Symmetry: C7
Subunit: 190 residues, 7 copies
């Protein structure tokens, strides 16, 4: 009835071994290394501006806020890395064969939530660009209304607080995931 | 009261046998073969670009991003295959006659979820085209606003990360489904 | 207090007998006959095109996709038949007088779900026409944007995969309903 | 503290008697009579057209589909009658004084659901007119797009299947309500 | 720590006595009197028109339906009275000091629901005016489309069935509330 | 590890004492005083108009309804006072240290609901102004449609019934809150 | 299998110590200091205006309300500080290793809710600017409608009550969080 070609099965077994090796190295070495790198990034001066008047840009309908754009470019690669690394670790947890079954399900759900939240971060950076564009377009059509000029300054300041929250939250995820997977794996294995 | 013509019943029984044979071959041979093919596809250079500056396209309102379009064309057939193959396997699980009843219901629900998620992937590729079109149309109407030019570059980069996530997720589904159906079928049969 | 004219009651009893006879014949003979007809329809070449480049239509804002329209015309009568036949069977289950009561309620709920899903299929065919029309209208207003031309090709391809899914799903419903009603009726009757 | 004028109380008691008499006659005689009338209406040729090409109307932006309008005019009075008759029966169930209390609550909830569904039927007939109007208006603004012409034909065909479903469903409600109220009243009274 | 001026407390006690007296008279006398008045109103010829062709108004974009407007003016005061009277009774139930506590909570919830539903009735009369206005405005912009003329006739007929349902439902509330409060108060008091 | 500067702690303790004193006086004296003031306000002639024809304003697109605006100005300060006073009382309940714990949580939830409802009242007054403005703007663009003139009269009448409901509801909150906090505090303290 | 480089582990341990020290100082000293500062801010005259006629600004489409803008500028830094400080404390609670486990989860959930509410406050300040702008734009297009002029005055008054509610609510959070974390930490540690 159901049987597998030995040659195909052997090649599949190598895939299982490769995923396991990548996951063990990622949790043991990559996750800790990133926590140190992100903590230093928060300390850097660009993400620690005391007064938000400086981030504001000057217009007469054209230039985007250059200071904010540069911060976004540094943030985007880090969000992408968490999404790619998390997917590999999640598959390793699912592949592992085990009370123990319940613990494994909790770990997969927790990893799944981190992946979904990361996508939200990428989406919010995209939403800021479209929203700022609509308001900047509005200023040209109705020059006299002061509030339209005021809203564009507010959207720039809100993004700065938000981007710092994303970097801190990604650093939080690495330490929390590292500790949780290490404690849970011993129970899941047995 | 209720009785069936023998000739009609015999022809129906052949349909039941045909569906069962296709399902056993699909789980035992097709699902494993695809996992190997998709894993190689991820390794290929086009899906592994290190810097997302290269994927960006240059405009003066016309050409779509050629590099992204080519990647989408390769991804679409694979999503279609999972939808067609999953439907045949789901019917086999429903047809099987069996604690055992509960296990069978779990398998049908799990297969149903994979089918619905696959449709979502096809929908997101469609949404990207309509959204990019609206933003490209906006650039022509309001040339001066820089943010509108910035949003179209962002939508191209977001799609690249998303398409790679779809290929990895489809590879994840094949290994997870193969293992789950094989373990569950022994219990369902008895 | 409450009593019924004998002449009116006799005519009502004939209605009850007529509905019962139609239902028994429909489950025993019509449902099996349709499963065979639909399975052959899937095998036919029009619903099995290997490459979706062929289904694409050529425009300079006018002609709809002729190949897709012809497939839709064949699909619509089959969806209509399931809705009409299911309503008659559902009334027979409700009329039957019976643990047994719970089984009867499950059957009515299952029949009700199949009826609602069938209406969804008719609605999706309608939505495709309105959506394709809006996008085709957009191409004329903004000729230069390539993405608008690309979206109309994508909507045609998505519909082809969807229509085949509807025919396969209707075939799935007939076999599942036939088996479920036959097993459940013995328990419901007793 | 709390007491009622005898003259006012006597007049109220006559209202209670009148509602009870109308309800007993409606369930015993009106509900059965309607089931016979609606069953004959379904048999009539206008509601049984084999091919939906005939219902389609011919345009060059003006005339509504005459065949569909005539069917709607016959359907509207029947939906109105169920709403008015159901309200009187529901009040009788609430007035009755009684395990028995739970049975009474189930009957009121079931009667309430039938009343709400009937309102939905009246609403859908209204929605078809507004939707067809918008699409017919669109054809004039953009004559070349064929899909806009195709959608108006589809909306006419969908309505025909829907109107027949309403007549069959109203016939279903009468038989189901008649049987349920008669069985439940004996328990509710005691 | 916490104590109240005797003079202020005495004046508050008079408020409590006044609310109690108004509530007892309203449930014992006002609620029954209204049930008789509304029942006669339903019997009156204007609310009982057999054919809905008569309610239809004739236009060449100007006059509202005079017959419908007159019916609405009679209905609006009655809906307002239920809202004002119900609020006073609800406060009396809350003030009463008492198994008994649970019964009191059920009565307040039931009174609260009647108050909210009454507001819905006032809202629907308002919605009809805005909706009819938009459709009448549409007829002038696009004279040729017949369906726009058809929709305005349909909205008038739907309102007539709805207004009669409101008057019957308000009559239903008075009898149901009268009976429920009288039965519940004895338990709540003890 | 964790310790507090004595000087800072002493100043914080004075804040705790001040909040407690304000709350005890507010529940014992302010809440009762307001109930008497609001009850007299309802008795005043402006809020008791018998016929709603008088509130209607006469237009030829300009003046707002003066009678309604004056009533709104009196209502707004009272809604603001409940929001400010409720916040202080809620903090006192949270600060109190205690079966007893559950009673305290119920009181905070009840106080929180009253605060949220009060904000809704302020929002509805704002919505009326924007909605009336849109309809008044519509009358000028399309002078002939009578229904647009009719809707503006209806929105004025609906607001009058609504404003009286707000004043009565605020009076209801004061008596209910006074009684509930006094009964609950003895249990919470012990 | 899983092991960590000693040098990397030592650097991570220093991160854990640094976060713990910052959290203990923040709860013991920063949270109490802020409560005193905010309480004085509420006492200041600008946030205590008796009549809201003064906050209103005079227009002939141009100037924003200067008095309101100045109040917003003072409020924004305080909301930002709570978001940044709360994130550090939340990580300390998660890092702590412990009935005790349940208490820790409650504290993290409570801290998470305070962080989300703070973001809502920043969002509402942004919404006021966009909404006031749209209404101010409307006044210019349609000068005659008085209600549009009335709505802009109402939006200014609503914001003043809202900003004072934010400052009071932030002061409430500091005292509640300080007390809760101090009581919970002893149980969480043991």
């Amino acid at each position: 009835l159901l049987k597998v070609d030995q040659e195909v099965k052997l090649k599949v077994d190598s895939f299982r071994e490769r995923i396991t090796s990548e996951a063990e190295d990622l949790v043991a070495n990559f996750f800790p290394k990133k926590l140190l790198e992100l903590d230093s990034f928060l300390k850097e001066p660009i993400l620690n501006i005391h007064d938000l008047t400086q981030i504001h840009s000057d217009m007469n309908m054209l230039k985007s806020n250059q200071q904010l754009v540069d911060i976004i470019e540094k943030v985007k690669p880090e969000i992408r890395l968490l999404i790619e690394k998390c997917n590999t670790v999640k598959m390793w947890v699912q592949l592992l064969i085990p009370f123990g079954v319940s613990i494994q399900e909790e770990t997969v759900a927790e990893l799944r939530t981190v992946e979904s939240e990361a996508a939200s971060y990428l989406d919010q950076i995209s939403r800021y660009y479209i929203t700022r564009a609509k308001l900047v377009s509005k200023i040209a059509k109705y020059p006299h209304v002061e509030d339209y000029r005021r809203t564009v300054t507010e959207i720039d300041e809100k993004e700065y607080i938000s981007l710092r929250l994303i970097i801190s939250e990604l650093r939080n995820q690495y330490v929390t995931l590292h500790d949780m997977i290490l404690k849970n794996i011993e129970k899941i294995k047995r």
